[PDB]
Design a protein around this nucleic acid. Structure first.
Ligand SMILES: Nc1nc2c(ncn2[C@@H]2O[C@H](COP(=O)(O)OP(=O)(O)NP(=O)(O)O)[C@@H](O)[C@H]2O)c(=O)[nH]1
Ligand code: FES
Ligand SMILES: [Zn+2]
Lengths: 65, 321, 85, 27, 97, 161, 157, 184, 37
RNA sequence: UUAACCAUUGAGGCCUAAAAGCAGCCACCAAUAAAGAAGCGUUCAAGCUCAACAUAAAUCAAAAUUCCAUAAUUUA
């Protein structure tokens, strides 16, 4: 759609008040699953995914019953 | 009362080469009319619904012909309509001594012809006694039909507070001083249209087809029922009721029917009852031909007022046809 | 079916954990709604006072026991028998 | 059908005597 | 017992003890076409940021184009880390559509 | 099917049966073998650091019993506490104990009792902390330390004034 | 040992209990039986040892409290049944409700009873010489006890 | 994961064969979990179908695979009614493998083994190794001075009058078509 | 009560007992789950 | 080896209005001290609640005439 890729955008509220109200500067510049191999044991996200795999490992056995 | 049954025809016995001859035709399934009580037995007793027939004996030395197989039979209620899995009506055992070749036994295996053996046919057959009530109750959700059935009989009907409730119709026989029993069944409130089987659908609407006559409850509160935003008047509801009934089946509209006004207790309902008197009969501000049977009586189920009056009218129409 | 339930204990003294666990089980809002007649109350102090629990009924029966030598299961089971009356 | 205690003991005795026969026949 | 999902007939329990007009009124306060998480709790009433499902469809979406709606998420997933909700919509974003 | 074996052959099998060696003392009854060396999972190492980090950052550590409230309902209380910039901490105290054994705080072990939530902040809003406790009636307070001073609930309430 | 007394007010009072005799003959024994070198030297007749693990009404104490190993728990539990069925524990009888009385039948003397007498079927067809159906005596759990006979004990009679 | 993870079909039509220790299919080739024959028996095509249908339905194509470790039926049988595949004790009838633990495949493999014509068991690589280690351990630490081989080979007691010539090779582990594990 | 050679639990609520010389699986929620050896 | 505990969204989309861990198929998903969706529920979401957090311990070896010696667990 020509409008959405312009200033008109689905992201900005399309409310009756908003009505599609763009540039990188206008939005957080800093902001501009995963692979356990990259993750490090201690790192909270590692355990998260590893436990996801452990839970999936439990789900692997659990699903079969 | 709309159960289903699977069957399997017996297989054809394989022939004995070098002049042994034909094989016996496989056993075939013949549903046999018996005492009407058998329906309870069929659905509950012998729960396994597969009726299979013995295959014909294979041709033996000395050119013995096949035993012709062992047939299988299904006792069924009198008046049952035999229909295919697809819903096509194979036949109906309306009268006694009415056997039907529901399934075909395997063609007898003949070595001289092209096919040495041949396997028996097996199929799913619906055998159903959709409620043949003397009259049936058709209304939109929250109409009050269950409440109406509650007081005429002692059936403890499920009261549908919300739509899509009381899915299974509840059969109630109405006793009279003349010792005549009239069976009335209340189905759940139906949606507008339903020709596409939306929501509840017209699957249960086959039950009405069996019923000789139709009973129409007309909730006065239903008049201008906001719902999502249809805001249907009772006048509109009847027009929709007539239209939707015609779409499902033309004959249903022609079938004898009666009208039952409901929820007249409220004083505003009485004012609406005068509006109900206005709507139909004489032309109003319409918003195809439609049918008005005029067998309409004003009653209120909650107050139990005028219930006795309606009873008489129903019996008169029944005794007439 | 309980008019009021009172639990009393002294925190820093390391004598009874069962009383707290019974308080913890009582803390569970699940039963608190079932026995809506009673408003749960928890209080603590510093004195050398053995932990105690007091249950009050409308009929006037008061059930009081101390956790020093009572395990949470017993009181609970004792409560269930008393509630039946 | 199990084998008695008499039967198993007596054979082992005969085996031991025959075991010695092996040794004395080696020199 | 919120009816969370991306009046009288919908809310009959309320009669026993408004959202119909508030729904269409809020339908103006929301986009006509984008789904919304109906925070119609069970009985306080509230509603906030819309959902990412149709957002991608009508747009697919650039990083600038998505961070702007992240602020809409920030406007009311009440978790403080706004970066996290971005991943949330992102997680749904890949799965959805 | 089994085929019977000549007696003599059966006698041979009876005498050639395997005999296992028997120990003088069952290993179980004997003193337990020296414990196999245990290892510390990375989470525990990080967990240990987390407990050290919260103590270093937060001057006041108070102890309020846990209730295992629903996560979303817990977030409701947490949201109220977050509005007051007071944080909640929960830890597998099994690793907490080593620190308390040898640390500036050594008399708080009795206060810590299993399922007990922790209170941590940078400001001693003790009066508001009691006020936030009044939000949930049953929710009790066991004690702890405020501004590096160990005290019980009654002292904390007097300290609140 | 703590006992609950009721009055309603109910309270549990702790009383001092006798302690184990000091200086076990074989220290470093994990389980209590092994500490005193009793691994394979007790049978159902040894009430003095067995009674120590029995509740006042004849029930077995939990394994955790006694501390016995699983192997000896099973052995101790089995002998107690045989001790009970043999009428060796007359003071540890069940706590029949006040509305009940003993079965009032005469009691047949037993010993070395593996199974509960109520649920054993009679052997109508006993069988011939190398077909005999055997009547079990004793418990297999005690096969490892020290034996002072020429050959192992006859379990099946 | 092999592309043809599912078990292939087996063609219906192409005394000592089962009376001794096996010499083929005794080692895991690709999979980690397999069914071990504990006796001598003949596998007809009906058994082959049961193994094929049961295993194929359960196994996950993404994470599991299976292969056949025995030849198709080739031995004639007369009242040429049908052909039976001979199997010797110790043979691995079927092999399974993939990114799965043994416990997941234990139930199906054990269920399939029960319906086989001969006694069988489901064994992983570890379990098969453990079984052999236990067998060797029993032989080394046996406290019985006398063993079947020494008595038979040395003709002690005049035993060979009552023994078959094959008995010396088997050493009493195998009798007829049955395998006695505990017998050292 | 079916007398079967192998007794197997069929649901979580099923429990096992050893009464009158035999093994029983008794389920209060679903009496169909009862088996005797 | 179960102990008695606890279960945090944009409905992940799309083919069945729309399909919620979960009609169906594919992604295989969201922050957090900590949770992927396991049974299952659900028109779909009702949610009954598994695994986490958060707590404490944890594979085998002796049917038909009328039952049929008697008995017996330890003395070297
Ligand atoms: N005021 C009033 N209320 C009535 C009357 N008849 C029924 N109701 C009310 O209508 C409520 C809604 O249920 P109701 O319509 O009776 O049930 P139903 O007949 O099974 N409905 P459905 O048509 O969907 O099958 C009932 O709870 C009852 O109190 C009446 O004559 N007057
Ligand atoms: S022999 Fe030591 S635990 Fe019993
Ligand atoms: Zn059950």
């Amino acid at each position: 759609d020509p409008t959405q890729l312009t200033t008109h955008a689905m992201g900005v509220n399309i409310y009756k008040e908003g009505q599609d109200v763009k540039a990188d500067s206008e939005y957080p510049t800093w902001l501009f699953p995963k692979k356990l191999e990259e993750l490090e044991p201690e790192s909270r996200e590692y355990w998260r995914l590893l436990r996801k795999q452990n839970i999936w490992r439990h789900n692997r056995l659990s699903k079969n019953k | 009362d709309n159960l289903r049954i699977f069957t399997k025809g017996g297989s054809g016995g394989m022939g004995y080469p070098r002049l042994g001859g034909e094989g016996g035709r496989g056993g075939d399934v013949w549903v046999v009319a018996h005492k009407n009580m058998t329906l309870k037995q069929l659905k509950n007793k012998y729960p396994q619904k597969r009726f299979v027939a013995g295959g014909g004996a294979n041709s033996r030395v000395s050119a013995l012909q096949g035993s012709k197989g062992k047939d299988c039979e299904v006792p069924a209620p009198v008046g049952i309509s035999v229909t295919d899995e697809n819903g096509q009506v194979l036949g109906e055992l309306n009268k006694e001594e009415d056997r039907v070749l529901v399934a075909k036994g395997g063609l007898g295996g003949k070595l001289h012809t092209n096919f040495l053996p041949l396997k028996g046919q097996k199929r799913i057959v619906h055998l159903d006694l959709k409620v043949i009530a003397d009259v049936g109750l058709v209304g939109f959700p929250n109409a009050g039909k269950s409440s109406l059935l509650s007081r005429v009989s002692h059936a403890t009907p499920v009261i549908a507070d919300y739509a899509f409730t009381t899915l299974r119709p509840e059969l109630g026989k109405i006793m009279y001083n003349d010792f005549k029993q009239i069976s009335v069944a209340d189905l759940p409130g139906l949606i507008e249209g339903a020709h596409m089987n939306k929501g509840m659908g017209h699957k249960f609407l086959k039950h009405l087809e069996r019923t000789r006559q139709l009973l129409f409850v007309v909730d006065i509160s239903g008049f201008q029922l906001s719902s999502v935003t249809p805001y249907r008047t009772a006048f509109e509801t009847i027009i929709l009721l007539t239209k939707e009934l015609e779409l499902y089946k033309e004959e249903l509209q022609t079938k004898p029917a009666l009208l039952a006004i409901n929820k007249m207790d409220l004083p505003d309902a009485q004012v609406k009852l005068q509006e109900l008197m206005k709507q139909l009969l004489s032309p109003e501000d319409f918003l195809e031909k439609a049918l008005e049977f005029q067998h309409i009586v004003p009653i209120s189920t909650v107050t139990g007022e005028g219930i006795a009056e309606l009873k008489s009218c129903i019996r008169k129409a029944l005794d007439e046809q | 079916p309980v008019k009021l339930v009172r639990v009393q204990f002294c925190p820093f003294e390391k004598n009874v954990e069962s009383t707290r666990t019974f308080l913890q089980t009582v803390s569970s809002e699940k039963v608190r709604a079932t026995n809506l007649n009673c408003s749960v109350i928890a209080d603590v102090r510093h004195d050398g006072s053995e932990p105690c629990v007091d249950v009050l009924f409308g009929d006037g029966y008061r059930l009081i026991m101390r956790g020093a030598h009572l395990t949470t299961q017993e009181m609970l089971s004792a409560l269930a028998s008393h509630i039946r009356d | 059908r199990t084998v008695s205690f008499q039967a198993k003991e007596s054979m082992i005795r005969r085996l031991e005597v025959e075991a010695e026969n092996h040794y004395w026949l080696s020199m | 017992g919120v009816i969370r999902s991306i009046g009288p007939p919908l809310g009959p329990i309320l009669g026993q003890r408004q959202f119909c007009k508030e729904f269409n009124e809020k339908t103006k306060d929301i986009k006509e076409g984008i789904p919304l998480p109906t925070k119609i709790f069970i009985f306080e009433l509230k509603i906030g940021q819309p959902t990412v499902s149709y957002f991608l469809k009508a747009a697919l979406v650039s990083l600038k184009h998505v961070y702007e709606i992240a602020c809409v998420k920030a406007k009311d997933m009440q978790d403080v880390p706004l970066s996290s909700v971005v991943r949330s919509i992102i997680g749904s974003a890949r799965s959805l559509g | 099917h089994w085929r019977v074996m000549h007696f003599q052959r059966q006698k041979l099998m009876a005498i050639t049966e395997y005999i296992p060696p028997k120990p003088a003392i069952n290993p179980r009854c004997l003193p337990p073998p020296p414990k196999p060396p245990k290892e510390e999972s990375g989470l525990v190492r990080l967990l240990r650091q987390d407990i050290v980090a919260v103590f270093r950052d937060n001057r006041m550590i108070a102890v309020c019993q846990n209730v295992a409230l629903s996560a979303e309902d817990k977030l409701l209380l947490r949201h109220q506490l977050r509005k007051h910039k007071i944080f909640i901490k929960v830890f597998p105290s099994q690793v907490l104990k080593p620190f308390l054994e040898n640390s500036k705080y050594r008399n708080l072990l009795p206060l810590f009792v299993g399922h007990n939530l922790l209170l941590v902040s940078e400001e001693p809003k003790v009066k508001e902390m009691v006020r936030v406790l009044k939000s949930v009636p049953f929710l009790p307070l066991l004690g702890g330390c405020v501004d590096d001073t160990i005290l019980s609930r009654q002292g904390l309430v007097d300290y609140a004034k | 040992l703590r006992e609950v007394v009721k009055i309603t007010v109910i309270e549990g009072r702790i009383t001092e209990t006798p302690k184990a005799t000091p200086d076990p003959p074989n220290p470093s024994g994990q389980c209590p039986i092994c500490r005193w070198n009793l691994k394979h030297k007790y049978t159902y007749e040894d009430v003095l040892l067995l009674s120590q693990f029995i509740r006042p009404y004849g029930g077995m104490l939990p394994r955790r409290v006694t501390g016995l190993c699983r192997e000896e728990h099973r052995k101790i539990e089995e002998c107690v049944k045989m001790a009970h069925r043999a009428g060796l524990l007359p003071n540890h009888r069940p706590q029949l409700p006040e509305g009940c009385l003993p079965k009032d039948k005469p009691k047949l003397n037993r010993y070395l009873t593996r199974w509960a007498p109520k649920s054993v079927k009679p052997i109508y067809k006993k069988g011939h010489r190398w077909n005999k159906v055997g009547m079990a005596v004793g418990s297999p759990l005690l096969k490892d006890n020290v034996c002072y006979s020429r050959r192992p004990l006859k379990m099946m009679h | 994961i092999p592309e043809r993870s599912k078990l292939k079909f087996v063609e219906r039509v192409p005394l000592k064969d089962i009376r001794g220790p096996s010499t083929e299919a005794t080692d895991f080739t690709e999979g980690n979990f397999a069914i071990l024959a504990l006796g001598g028996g003949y596998l007809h095509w009906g058994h082959f179908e049961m193994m094929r249908l049961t295993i194929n339905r359960f196994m996950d194509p993404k994470n599991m695979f299976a292969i056949w470790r025995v030849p198709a039926p080739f031995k004639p049988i007369t009242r040429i009614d049908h052909y039976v595949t001979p199997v010797k004790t110790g043979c691995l009838v079927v092999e399974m493998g993939g990114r799965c633990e043994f416990e997941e495949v234990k139930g199906i493999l054990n269920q399939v083994a029960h319906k086989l014509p001969f006694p069988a068991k489901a064994v992983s690589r570890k379990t098969l190794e453990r079984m052999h280690q236990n067998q060797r351990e029993r032989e080394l630490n046996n406290q019985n001075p006398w063993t079947f081989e020494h008595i038979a080979t040395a003709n002690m007691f005049g035993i060979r009058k009552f023994l078959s010539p094959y008995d010396l090779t088997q050493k009493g582990r195998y009798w007829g078509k049955f395998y006695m594990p505990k017998r050292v | 009560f079916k007398t079967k050679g192998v007794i197997k639990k069929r649901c979580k609520d099923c429990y096992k007992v050893k009464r009158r010389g035999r093994w029983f699986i008794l389920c209060k929620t679903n009496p169909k789950h009862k088996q005797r050896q």
